[PDB]
Amino acid sequence: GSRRASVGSHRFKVTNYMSPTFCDHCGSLLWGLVKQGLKCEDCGMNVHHKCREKVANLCEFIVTD
Amino acid sequence: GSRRASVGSHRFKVTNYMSPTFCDHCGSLLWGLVKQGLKCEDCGMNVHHKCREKVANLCEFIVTD
Ligand SMILES: [Zn+2]
Ligand SMILES: [Zn+2]
Ligand SMILES: [Zn+2]
Ligand SMILES: [Zn+2]
Numbered sequence: 001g002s003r004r005a006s007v008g009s010h011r012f013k014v015t016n017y018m019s020p021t022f023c024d025h026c027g028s029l030l031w032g033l034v035k036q037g038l039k040c041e042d043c044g045m046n047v048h049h050k051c052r053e054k055v056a057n058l059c060e061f062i063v064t065d
Numbered sequence: 066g067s068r069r070a071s072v073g074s075h076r077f078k079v080t081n082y083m084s085p086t087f088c089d090h091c092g093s094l095l096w097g098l099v100k101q102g103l104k105c106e107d108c109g110m111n112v113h114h115k116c117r118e119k120v121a122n123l124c125e126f127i128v129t130d
Contacts (some may be wrong), residue, residue, distance in 0.1 A: 004073030004107070005127060009107060042069070061069065 003052075009057040010045060012038035025051040069128040075110060076124070077103035077117055090116040 014035055021030045022047050023037060030036035037048050043061045079100050086095045089110045095101035102113050108126045113126060 002072075002122070003073060004124075006069060007067075007072050008069030008128070009112040025091070059069075063073075 004061055004063045005060050006042065007058075007060050008042065010040040010059040011042050011054065012045075012047065013041050013050055014037040015046070021046055023048045023051050025055050070125050071107065071128055072123075072125050073107065073118065074122040074124050075105040075108050077112065078106050078112075080111070082103040082111075086111055088113045088116050090120050 008031050015038060016034050017030060017036050022028065023030055023034065025047050028048070030046065030048060037046055038052055041058060043059050045055070045059075047055060067085055067128065080103060081099045082095060082101045085102065086089055090112050093113070095111065095113060102111055104111050105124060106122050110120070110124070112120060
């Protein structure tokens with residue numbers, strides 16, 4: 001048997017975080033109070049602008065529907 | 066770049082076909098007027114009962130959302 005996974009590449013979008021949030025790539029704070037970084041619209045990964053260049057494109061999540 | 070695909074295993078359900086439908090595995094008609102075969106709830110593959118055990122479990126389709 002297998003989980004069903006959605007498998008593609010990240011789709012990052014600039015995001016306003018309402019609480020202090022860290023980069024899921026590098027571990028440093030997403031600095032500031034607005035437009036602090038990017039969130040993948042598919043898997044929710046949060047990254048700095050600079051870290052968008054550094055993450056693997058692979059984007060997977062388990063479909064729990 | 067990558068398509069987004071849903072990737073899991075088939076989820077076959079006994080199906081009452083309304084029009085003449087063929088087995089996507091073996092090519093023979095799904096005989097009868099009711100419960101003629103099984104349809105995968107995820108990818109739509111149609112199979113005879115006997116062909117359910119002959120198909121690969123792999124079930125993928127492109128997410129066009
Ligand atoms: Zn992602
Ligand atoms: Zn970072
Ligand atoms: Zn399937
Ligand atoms: Zn068949």
